[PDB]
């Protein structure tokens with residue numbers, strides 16, 4: 001596994017090692033707001049993060065992950081399109097080199113400056129590694145970021161990034177409340193898709209919030225100071241760590257709202 005985001009190892013190459021890259025339910029996708037259809041069968045969405053227990057932040061050479069204790073049903077996602085209970089395991093972001101790109105999903109071809117992914121696994125499968133092998137194994141809550149006013153609840157993340165500059169560095173990251181990263185509205189679009197990095201497994205129910213959160217230019221500039229490289233290696237800024245939109249194929253995008 002030597003994949004990344006550059007010319008030589010980026011998204012256009014992934015299919016060689018991971019042929020599912022050209023599969024029937026790949027992510028991300030463009031969300032055509034006019035075509036997406038309100039679905040009255042969707043049950044109310046339930047984001048229950050009050051007992052979330054963050055543990056650590058890790059630069060893995062692709063993004064940074066904020067990791068949670070998922071040894072029990074602390075923070076969970078239910079409802080909406082979902083049957084059963086999905087436990088929060090981690091969140092991370094994808095972002096650009098400039099404010100006009102960075103998101104993975106697009107909205108009528110619009111690219112946001114970044115996209116937050118809150119990753120949850122279906123507890124009926126017992127562990128995350130088993131869940132990723134199932135078509136309904138994961139639920140990813142995707143939230144767009146635009147540049148404007150600062151997001152206060154993001155600043156503790158921003159301020160630890162200096163300590164995890166390079167690939168393989170981690171830091172303690174306890175007591176972080178992911179509720180501070182949500183927008184006011186839980187209106188969403190949903191469709192069946194995949195992981196957006198290798199191994200590209202077709203195991204995700206996507207729930208993409210319609211309302212972006214606002215972050216400041218200063219906050220996102222700090223994301224852009226991270227490195228893809230390890231300590232001591234030539235600097236490669238961690239920017240443009242997004243996969244472009246993939247073919248929708250035989251899928252419909254459903255809206256939770258009228």
Ligand SMILES: COc1ccc(C[C@H]2SC(=S)NC2=O)c(OC)c1
Nearest residue numbers: 117119132140194195196197198199
């Ligand atoms: C093997 O299981 C994996 C591997 C990689 C990722 C991260 C990808 S998938 C996504 S959506 N956005 C991302 O960056 C997973 O989600 C953590 C799950």
Ligand SMILES: [Zn+2]
Nearest residue numbers: 092094117196
């Ligand atoms: Zn992601």
